Amino acid sequence: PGATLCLGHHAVPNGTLVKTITDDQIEVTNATELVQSSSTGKICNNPHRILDGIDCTLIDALLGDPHCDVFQNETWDLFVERSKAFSNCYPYDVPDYASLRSLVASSGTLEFITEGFTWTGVTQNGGSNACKRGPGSGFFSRLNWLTKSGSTYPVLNVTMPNNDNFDKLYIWGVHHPSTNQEQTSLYVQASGRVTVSTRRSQQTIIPNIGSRPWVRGLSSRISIYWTIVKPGDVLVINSNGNLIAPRGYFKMRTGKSSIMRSDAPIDTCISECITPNGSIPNDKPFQNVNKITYGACPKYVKQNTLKLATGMRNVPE
Amino acid sequence: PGATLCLGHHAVPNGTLVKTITDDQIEVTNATELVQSSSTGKICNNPHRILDGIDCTLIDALLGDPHCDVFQNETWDLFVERSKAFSNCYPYDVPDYASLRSLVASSGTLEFITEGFTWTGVTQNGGSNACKRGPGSGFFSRLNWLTKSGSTYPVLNVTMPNNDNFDKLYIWGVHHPSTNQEQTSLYVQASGRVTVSTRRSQQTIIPNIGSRPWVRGLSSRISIYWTIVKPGDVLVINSNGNLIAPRGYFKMRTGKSSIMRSDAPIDTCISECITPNGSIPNDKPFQNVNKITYGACPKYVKQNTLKLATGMRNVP
Amino acid sequence: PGATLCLGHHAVPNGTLVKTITDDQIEVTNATELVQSSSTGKICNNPHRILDGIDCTLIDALLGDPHCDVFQNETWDLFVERSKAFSNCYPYDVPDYASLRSLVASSGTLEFITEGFTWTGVTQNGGSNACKRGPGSGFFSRLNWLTKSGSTYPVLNVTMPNNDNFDKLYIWGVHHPSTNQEQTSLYVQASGRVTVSTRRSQQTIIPNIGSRPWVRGLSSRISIYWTIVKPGDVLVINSNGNLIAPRGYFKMRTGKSSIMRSDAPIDTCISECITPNGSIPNDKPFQNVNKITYGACPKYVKQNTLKLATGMRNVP
Amino acid sequence: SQHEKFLEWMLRKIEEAIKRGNKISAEFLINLAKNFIHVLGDDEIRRRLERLERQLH
Amino acid sequence: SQHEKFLEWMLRKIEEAIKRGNKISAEFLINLAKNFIHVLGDDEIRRRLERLERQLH
Amino acid sequence: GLFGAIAGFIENGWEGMIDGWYGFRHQNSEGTGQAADLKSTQAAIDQINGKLNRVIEKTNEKFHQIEKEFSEVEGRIQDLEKYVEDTKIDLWSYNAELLVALENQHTIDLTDSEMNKLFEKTGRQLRENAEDMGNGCFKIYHKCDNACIESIRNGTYDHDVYRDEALNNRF
Amino acid sequence: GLFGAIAGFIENGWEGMIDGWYGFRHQNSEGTGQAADLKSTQAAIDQINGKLNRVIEKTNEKFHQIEKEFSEVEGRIQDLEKYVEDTKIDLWSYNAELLVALENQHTIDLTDSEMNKLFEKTGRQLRENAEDMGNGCFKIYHKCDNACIESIRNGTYDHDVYRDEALNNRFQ
Amino acid sequence: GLFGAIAGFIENGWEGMIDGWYGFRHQNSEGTGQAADLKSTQAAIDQINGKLNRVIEKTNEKFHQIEKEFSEVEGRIQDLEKYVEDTKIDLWSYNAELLVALENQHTIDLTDSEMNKLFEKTGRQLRENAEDMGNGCFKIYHKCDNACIESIRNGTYDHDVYRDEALNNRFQIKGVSGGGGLNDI
Ligand SMILES: *[C@@H]1O[C@H](CO)[C@@H](O[C@@H]2O[C@H](CO)[C@@H](O[C@@H]3O[C@H](CO)[C@@H](O)[C@H](O)[C@@H]3O)[C@H](O)[C@H]2NC(C)=O)[C@H](O)[C@H]1NC(C)=O
Ligand SMILES: *[C@@H]1O[C@H](CO)[C@@H](O[C@@H]2O[C@H](CO)[C@@H](O[C@@H]3O[C@H](CO)[C@@H](O)[C@H](O)[C@@H]3O)[C@H](O)[C@H]2NC(C)=O)[C@H](O)[C@H]1NC(C)=O
Ligand SMILES: *[C@@H]1O[C@H](CO)[C@@H](O[C@@H]2O[C@H](CO)[C@@H](O)[C@H](O)[C@H]2NC(C)=O)[C@H](O)[C@H]1NC(C)=O
Ligand SMILES: *[C@@H]1O[C@H](CO)[C@@H](O[C@@H]2O[C@H](CO)[C@@H](O)[C@H](O)[C@H]2NC(C)=O)[C@H](O)[C@H]1NC(C)=O
Ligand SMILES: *[C@@H]1O[C@H](CO)[C@@H](O[C@@H]2O[C@H](CO)[C@@H](O)[C@H](O)[C@H]2NC(C)=O)[C@H](O)[C@H]1NC(C)=O
Ligand SMILES: *[C@@H]1O[C@H](CO)[C@@H](O[C@@H]2O[C@H](CO)[C@@H](O)[C@H](O)[C@H]2NC(C)=O)[C@H](O)[C@H]1NC(C)=O
Ligand SMILES: *[C@@H]1O[C@H](CO)[C@@H](O[C@@H]2O[C@H](CO)[C@@H](O)[C@H](O)[C@H]2NC(C)=O)[C@H](O)[C@H]1NC(C)=O
Ligand SMILES: *[C@@H]1O[C@H](CO)[C@@H](O)[C@H](O)[C@H]1NC(C)=O
Ligand SMILES: *[C@@H]1O[C@H](CO)[C@@H](O)[C@H](O)[C@H]1NC(C)=O
Ligand SMILES: *[C@@H]1O[C@H](CO)[C@@H](O)[C@H](O)[C@H]1NC(C)=O
Ligand SMILES: *[C@@H]1O[C@H](CO)[C@@H](O)[C@H](O)[C@H]1NC(C)=O
Ligand SMILES: *[C@@H]1O[C@H](CO)[C@@H](O)[C@H](O)[C@H]1NC(C)=O
């Protein structure tokens, strides 16, 4: 006479293997994945404002390449550069290209304010057939090619004060010709010089004459430089030749803006975390998609799978 | 008959909530704070030797700005730069300013030894009104403004050996005038050139003529450059114009010296850890005051509070 | 009419002290060391291909210093630079020396292909008595000293296309004379100019005339520069004086190659991990030998000992 | 009674997980509840669980 | 003798904490000892604890 | 496990248990039966869900960073950028591995602990009316119908009511 | 806790216990009484103090570092410096959070363990003269005055002295 | 330990036990003896070897890196390189210290647990024929020769065979006359 009372736990037919401190593989009833290893392959247009350059790099839209004149006065939270982007204007080079790209991307705006620079004794709006705007020649929309007027090239001394409550970004350039004939024909003097200066900074460039490889029909170059003028300071331009003059300034901003190289398409969805492989969910703590991220993203790790146990040890029959 | 013997544990009226692995807020009997989140607002002058710059930056005291003449031959453990600091001499700029500031701050001394540089055929000790020293014009106390003597500027060629057992820091400059008339009236030649070289390094600067913004009445500038000469090596200065020559060298040292930007007032106390917000105690392993620290400091964290349980579960 | 059955555990006479979360020193029956703190003092020649430079730095062998001629067309996994290394050629300096050294070390090869550069109107194969090859004067094996032919130095304009499927590394130079007489006798023009350009990059160097310290009989210098030409791109050299021309290109590689400064000798053994102190085993996860490592290496830590308990508490 | 109390505390925790943005824990608790609900006996818990499941994705 | 031995060992650990520079642990042990002191019954332990409290950076 | 219940003196689990994580199986004069215990299941679920909430807490939001892929060889600065990114990746990988290992070990240990605690509570309830058979089962030495099993499973069991019969059947 | 004593079969704590962390309450013919057990309190305090000394050990001293605040935009190098500092800060914040969490979990578990160990030690002392009531109290089946309670609380309790009476009172 | 066996109710270890980590010591009518238990020893060794293999798993292989020693003062970039290397070193040192501390604590706790589990298994085996003396020893209330101890040490002990004699020797009222053993046959 009597009864038996047994204590026990549950089990499952198919368990899950997980790692522990002691055992490399141990079977539990259930587990969950902590590493996001897949992406949809499309960048969601929300909540972050995405601006696709299509066939334009950021520097081209900044300078004003003709086929990039659609991104004027534009803003963005993430600018996406494609691999198909091309340059279709005057052959140029930017010493410290990465820094200018980074600062413009972190600013997050291409808002351009035009200023009435006073150019006394020079021909304005010079162009070239390698940078066609419409059927005829053209040039960078935010730059002005100053050349000879009459037969003399005056020593230009122009000033522009910063009386606003925000920083100003000025993009200017120096023209490097291919032969002394071109130099003397366009800028009279045999050797030019450009000096862009503030109260605490100076930048003097001497043009260099020589034949470069043929790019879009030209063996001449343009060197692009930038200058930031703070409130209360003054920009001074002193040039005796080969000046690619600015037309105004860019309003510098500070925020959460950035840039990303990616070839994934842009879709209408919502996702906080974007990678070059596409948008990924932010519910898991880690991710193995790409080390390049933007937004509220899981932390990148080398492991493709990490399973966290959500149940007890699975001891079947 | 019989007796009852009960086991138990203590409890408190007001426990403290802490975080665990399984519970975000669980009540224990007592806990302690592990994050230092407050400062007095003052920098203690001990144990670290604190040198306050007041109105001078480290670079201006290096060059010899007038109102910085007190900082000659000074040493420090932590140099404090204030936000009210201003320059009141010849307008200058330093290419790679950050590196010069950092290396001088890490050296920790402004000990300057004058060397007898022999400048034969030039006018020495030039001055300027933007750098007033007393009743007349002046210049940086550690630099020598060389200009024309008579009507010629020779190719200056001077050598200086380092026969000591330590490194020598030489500060020199290149004058960028504002007009061609100024250039020709000061240095004769239409274009200058400065070349400072050692046995395994060389630096050549070409002056740049042009108008800069008006700073203390002047549109001309000076660019500052440095050169380190090792024991056994030799410094060579070769210039045909616009040379702002060195007057000697600074002795270089290595140690625990640094620099910090802060507006906190200095006080008489002892604290191993200094931040721009003031001196903080180092009893707690972490701190949430400032990521900029100096000395024996708790590590900076983003959390403003982290409570470590020092007692059992409080079960009232 | 009974018996006693006692439970117990083993013990050892001399246990080992370890650290835990709650106790700084507790005795257990056994422990193992997790920090590798000792090295043999020698670099193992396997499995990694070790290239000993003896008396040459990587840059000197790159240029083609005479006593480094044994390093032509050499490959390596780890290049070892010694402290006894010296230069015995034309006195030179490399702007951004560290970057060139790093990129050549990461390429891991000195395979040099000669290209038929056509220099019309100049004298080739110039030499000097500071860069002796045998009893007489010589020059860098990979560089060509171009001077005047007859009494003229034309504007040299040479192009070389990259029609291969790999990158080309070009090393070239610019000669800085000490006097204007030397400049005019070597390159006719009073001031030279060298421009090396690709389709999206360009470099223009203007020589600097002046006296430098006497190194191996000379007060002139050479500045070394490099240019990478991608497949489909073209190298263009345009120079009117002072050009130290390339003789060809170096093939660029990508892989597990690197460089290390060490004075340890090379021995016959197998070890995946090399440090400046020698080869170390990778059995322990951590090491306290040197923060500079190469290969499958334990991670560097500040602790010199970390004991992992492999047994129970030792209770004698 | 007891079963109801278990499922009700579970529903409270699911509501908190939804109201904190933690979706993995919400899914964990929802799956466990979807296996503990005695079909034909607690339709109210089933309906409230479906409602909390909607506020998730 | 048991309570006395406990409190004396407490004082020894406080002295070590002072002689090692660890102040948080010294304050922890000092507060606990000042909570274990049998009010109306012991005074020497209180005096030694006050002396160690004064010697505290 | 540290407590030796799961995969210990308990031989194996019950795949039939579907309404709980821990429970009772009984065999008496009326037959056999099974019923889950909700308290220990609730405790285990609370601990597991708490550690889940702690793990998956959204705490990372980054915007403008550094470049991590490069098309041209540059040297020193690129070396430094690559080294920094590699260091960060390695450190976070180590953190994730150690985290999952520690959390899984603790999960197994706490489930073992909950099982052992339920066993200990049932044993203390039964008092001197039953004996531990060593395999997670109690042999009850008195008449215990379905209502008695229910009173045991919900904590209301009164041992003195059956103490005399149990002692008579035991010794 | 893992051991189920504190917030387990022990219903709640005793706010009247001010001279210890764990202890005994007794009820016998002479009345009621309370006395702390100092060995378990000492063990728990030692573990907590060792944890405290390990955590708060001063091990960080840095001097000349990198700049962490900037007044002008520079680009690549400033981006790298900011990224390095942010990475370091995030890693150390994670380390601190995980450290405090693990330490608190271990503290709760070890205090529960000390309570359970004291309970089991008292039970092994009592042998067959008492029964576990399931609520942290032992029912003793013989007359046990204040001296007997003291003999239990200081480890000198002799079970054989009362075994005959206790067995007579237990089994009917 | 958390379980109070090692350095708890068991006074100390046995330096004589050399063929195992846990075991039994017995004293009966035939004399004294000692024998190791291989199940608990194997389990403890298995867990320790698992954590050891997990810790020392080779997972780091790096090649070309950054420079970490410098011959000339340079400033900003060199400051940044030194700061990066110092940060990495400090973080890895902290990781190593915390790892070894946690692992040693867990090893001590799991060995204590194994001892306690063996003790409880033996007690549940002995059932009502023995009593826990509180110092890791069981007082067995029946005749138990070397074969009986062997049956205990390998799990085959049958309690019902000896239960009657064990109860007869256990529950004795020695104070009353005839409270000992029943001498009727
Ligand atoms: C997300 O996109 C990135 C970028 O495309 C992917 O990383 C890269 O993936 C390619 C393969 O599509 C890798 O190239 C391969 O490398 C191996 C090296 O052993 C080589 O054997 C193959 O022939 C091929 O060239 C590339 O290495 C890799 N880059 C990095 C830095 O990992 C990534 O895989 C994508 N991830 C997902 C989840 O889509
Ligand atoms: C307790 O731990 C210690 C380590 O702290 C163990 O001592 C070492 O054990 C290893 C075996 O794993 C021995 O390695 C052998 O050494 C010989 C001679 O060099 C070599 O030829 C073998 O290939 C192997 O590497 C080692 O000698 C020994 N001693 C030392 C100082 O390392 C010990 O075995 C452990 N004891 C137990 C009971 O686990
Ligand atoms: C928690 O610990 C703190 C330690 O500072 C205790 O605060 C101290 O309490 C003692 C005793 O009353 C006082 O002498 C000190 O002046 C207090 N220090 C303070 C307030 O900074 C606190 O009482 C403890 N809490 C509990 C519940 O025990
Ligand atoms: C230490 O001082 C810094 C300023 O140097 C404080 O940082 C400011 O904090 C406020 C409040 O969060 C912000 O609104 C400002 O934007 C911050 N300024 C900068 C430059 O970061 C910091 O809060 C102070 N910390 C303490 C503990 O006093
Ligand atoms: C490995 O070699 C390094 C040198 O590269 C040694 O580091 C030096 O050690 C000495 C002696 O303590 C110090 O005076 C130097 O300041 C150290 N230099 C550096 C750069 O750290 C290191 O001690 C050697 N280690 C072993 C195990 O031999
Ligand atoms: C482990 O838990 C997960 C929790 O998500 C279970 O997955 C869900 O199971 C329910 C079953 O009612 C499905 O409706 C969901 O769609 C599942 N979600 C996902 C993301 O798959 C999983 O079934 C559990 N595993 C075991 C063996 O119980
Ligand atoms: C432990 O408790 C016992 C209680 O039995 C103490 O023994 C008593 O000690 C007092 C004081 O010396 C005597 O007046 C009593 O007569 C003793 N009672 C008995 C039954 O012997 C004992 O002193 C306590 N301490 C120790 C260390 O054993
Ligand atoms: C851009 O915005 C400014 C300010 O609103 C405006 O003056 C200007 O005309 C706009 N367009 C261009 C091309 O600058
Ligand atoms: C350039 O113009 C500014 C503004 O009037 C003036 O201050 C400066 O002296 C001028 N520079 C010249 C004329 O060289
Ligand atoms: C400059 O002085 C040095 C002194 O050693 C000398 O060697 C060199 O020839 C001098 N140069 C000129 C141009 O006088
Ligand atoms: C280096 O190797 C290449 C292999 O293509 C060969 O053509 C070349 O002649 C070699 N150079 C020397 C100097 O041996
Ligand atoms: C140099 O040669 C290239 C070859 O294509 C040619 O395009 C270029 O015009 C030449 N330059 C000069 C100055 O002759």
How much distance in Å is there from the Cα of C14 to the middle of ligand 4? 56
* Separation of alpha carbons C299 and H94, rounded Å: 12
Structure-block tokens of residue F77? 């600065």
Cβ atoms of B309 and B296 within 8 Å: the answer is no
HEC profile for chain B?
A: CCEEEEEEEECCCCCEEECCCCCCCEEECCEEECEECCCCCCEEEECCCEEECCCCCHHHHHHCCHHHHHHCCCECCEEEECCCCCCCCCCEECCCHHHHHHHHHHHCECCEEECCCCCCCCECCCCEEEEEECCEEECCCCEEECECECCECCCEEEEEECCCCCCEEEEEEEEECCCHHHHHHHHCCCCCEEEEECCCCEEEECCCCCCCCCECCECCEEEEEEEEECCCCEEEEEEEECEEEECEEEECCCCCCEEEECCCCEEEEECCEEECCEEECCCCCEECCCCCCEEECCEECCCCCCEEECCCECCC
Q: How far apart are CA C239 and CA F113, in angstroms?
A: 83
E15 is written with which tokens? Answer: 């002295």
CA distance B209 to C296: 57
Neighbours of H55 (CB within 10 A): 17
What does the CA dihedral B70, B74, B80, B85 come to, rounded to 10 degrees?
30
DSSP chain A: --EEEEEEEB--SS-EEE--SS-SSEEES-EEE-EE----SSEEEESS-EEE-SS--HHHHHHT-GGGTTSTT-B-SEEEE-SS----SS-EE-TTHHHHHHHHHHHTB--EEE-----TTEEEEE-EEEEEETTEEE--TTEEEEEEBTTB---EEEEEE--SSS-EEEEEEEEE-SSHHHHHHHHSSSS-EEEEE-SS-EEEE-----PPPPBTTBS-EEEEEEEEE-TT-EEEEEEEE-EEEE-EEEE---SS-EEEE----EEEEE-SEEETTEEE-SSSSEE-S-S--BBS-PEE-S-S--EEE-S-B----
Chains D and B touch (3+ CB pairs under 8 A): no
Interface test with D, best of F21, F52, F151 (most D CBs within 10 A): F52
Name the residue in chain F with its Cα closest to that of B26. F50
Pocket lining: B157 vs ligand 10, CB cutoff 6 Å: yes
- Is residue G12, in this structure, part of any structural domain at all? no
Spacing, Cα E24 to ligand 3 middle (Å): 12
Taking the CA of residue F40 and the nearest CA in chain D, the distance in Å comes to 11
**Contact of A276 with A265, CB cutoff 8 Å:** no
C175 shares contact with chain B (CB less than 8 Å) = no
* Interface residues from chain H to B (CB-CB < 8 Å): 72-76, 79
Which of helix, strand or coil describes residue E14?
helix
Phi/psi for D13 (5° steps) reads -70, -35
DSSP annotation of G7 reads I
Angle at C110 between CA C105 and CA C112, to 5 degrees: 145
Q: Do G76 and A252 touch (CB under 8 A)?
A: no
Considering CB atoms only, which of B93, B208, B211 is closest to A201?
A: B93
Query: Is A210 an interface residue toward C (CB < 8 Å)?
Result: yes
Tokens 């990616």 locate to A262
Report the C-alpha gap between F7 and A114 in whole angstroms.
78
CATH number of the domain within which G37 lies:
3.90.20.10
CB interface of B with G, residues 197-226, below 8 Å: none
Is F88 contained in some domain?
Answer: yes
Expressed as residue numbers, the domain containing A107 is 49-264
Ligand 3 touching residue E31 (CB < 6 A) = yes
Do the strands G130-132 and A243-246 form a parallel or antiparallel pair, or are they unpaired? unpaired
Between the alpha carbon of residue B66 and those of residues A33, B60, B80, B127, B219, the distances in Å are 67, 9, 19, 12, 20
Contacts of E23 in chain B (CB under 8 A): 283
Query: Which of C313, C315, C316, C270 shows the shortest CA–CA distance to C295?
Result: C270
Among candidate residues A215, A197, A213, the one with its CA nearest the CA of residue A205 = A197
Inter-chain CB proximity B24 and F47 less than 8 Å: no
Partnered with residue A171 across adjacent β-strands are A226
Inter-chain contact H4–G77, Cβ cutoff 8 Å? Answer: no
* Ligand found nearest the CA of C109: 11
Distances (CA, A) of C136 to A112, C129, C215: 65, 7, 18
Name the one residue in this structure whose structure tokens are 């291909």: C49
Of F88, F113, F127, the CB nearest to G2: F113
CA dist., res. A164 & res. A150, Å (int): 37
CA C306 to chain centre: 35
Establish whether residue A72 lines the binding site of ligand 8, counting it when its CB lies within 6 angstroms of any ligand atom: yes
Q: Are B172 and B225 in contact (CB under 8 A)?
A: yes
CA angle C204, C208, C209 (to 5 degrees): 150
User: Which residues on chain B are in Cβ contact (under 8 Å) with H72?
Assistant: 228
Backbone angles phi, psi at A115, to 5 degrees: -120, 145
Residue F17 lies in a domain: no
Which residues from chain H sit within 8 angstroms of residue C10, using beta carbons?
Answer: 13-15, 17-18, 20-23
Q: CA-CA distance, C296 to C287, in Å (whole number)?
A: 12
CA distance to partner chain A, nearest, from residue B203 (Å): 17
Q: Chain C partners of B202 at a C-beta cutoff of 8 Å?
A: 93, 176, 208, 212, 221
Angle, helices E2-18 vs E44-54, to 10°: value is 10
* Helix or strand (DSSP H, E) at C92: strand C92-93
CA H107, CA H115: separation in Å to the nearest integer?
12
Residue F144 belongs to a domain = yes
Measured CA to CA, the distance from residue C141 to residue C246 in angstroms comes to: 10
Amino acid symbol at A139 = F
Chain A residues inside the 8 Å CB shell of G79 = 102
List chain G residues with CB under 8 Å of A100. Answer: 75
Q: Is A208 on the interface with C (CB under 8 A)?
A: yes
Q: How many CB pairs (< 8 A) connect F and H?
A: 55
Q: A176 to chain C: which residues are within 8 Å by CB?
A: 202
- Say whether C9 and H60 touch across the interface (CB within 8 A): no
C159 touches chain A (CB under 8 A): yes
Contact (CB, 8 A) for B248 and B7? no
Q: Which domain holds residue D28?
A: 2-54
* Cα dihedral G58/G64/G65/G68 (nearest 10): 110
State in Å: Cα D9 to ligand 6 middle.
20
Going by alpha carbons, the residue nearest to atom 10 of ligand 7 is G147
Burial class, A178, CB count within 10 angstroms (exposed 0-12 / middle 13-18 / buried 19+): middle
Q: Ligand nearest A212 Cα, by number? A: 12
Tokens of B28: 């224990």
Under a CB-based contact definition with an 8 Å cutoff, are residues H47 and C303 in contact?
no
Q: How far is CA F62 from the centre of its chain?
A: 37
Q: Name the residue type at position H150.
A: E
Is ligand 9 within 6 A of the CB of residue A118? Answer: no
Enclosing domain of residue G87: 22-170
Best B103, B228, B250, B301 residue to mutate vs chain H (most H CBs within 10 Å): B103
Q: How far is the CA of E34 from the centre of ligand 3 (A)?
A: 9
Nearest residue CA, atom 4 of ligand 8? A113
In a domain, H75, yes or no: yes
G56 closest CB neighbour out of E6, E9, E22: E22
Q: Is residue G1 part of a domain?
A: no
Q: How far is the CA of C237 from the centre of ligand 12 (A)?
A: 10
The tokens 């002796």 sit on which residue?
Answer: C132
Could you tell me if residue B69 is left (phi over 0), alpha (psi between -120 and 50 degrees) or otherwise beta?
Answer: alpha
Q: Give the angle A12-A15-A17 at the CA atoms, nearest 5°.
A: 160
Alpha carbon distance G21, G44 (integer Å): 9
Cβ atoms within 10 Å of B267's Cβ, excluding its own: 15
Q: Following DSSP, what letter does each residue of A137-178 receive, concatenated? A: EE--TTEEEEEEBTTB---EEEEEE--SSS-EEEEEEEEE-S
Task: Quote the number of domains for chain G.
Answer: 1
Distance CA A274, CA A49 (A): 12
Ligand nearest to the CA of E26: 3
Please count the structural domains in chain D: 1
Question: How far is Cα of residue C302 from the mean position of the Cα atoms in its chain?
Answer: 27
- DSSP alpha helices (H): ranges in C79-152? 97-107
In terms of Cα–Cα distance, which of C295, C228, C292 is closest to C257? C295
HEC-encoded secondary structure of chain F? CCCCHHHHHCCCCECCCCCCCEEEEEEECCEEEEEEEHHHHHHHHHHHHHHHHHHCCCCCCECCCCCCCCCCCCCHHHHHHHHHHHHHHHHHHHHHHHHHHHHHHHHHHHHHHHHHHHHHHHHHHHCCCEEECCCCEEEECCCCCHHHHHHHHCCCCCHHHHHHHHHHHHC
Nearest Cβ partner for F84 among H84, H99, H117? H84
CA of C269 to the centre of ligand 2 (A): 21
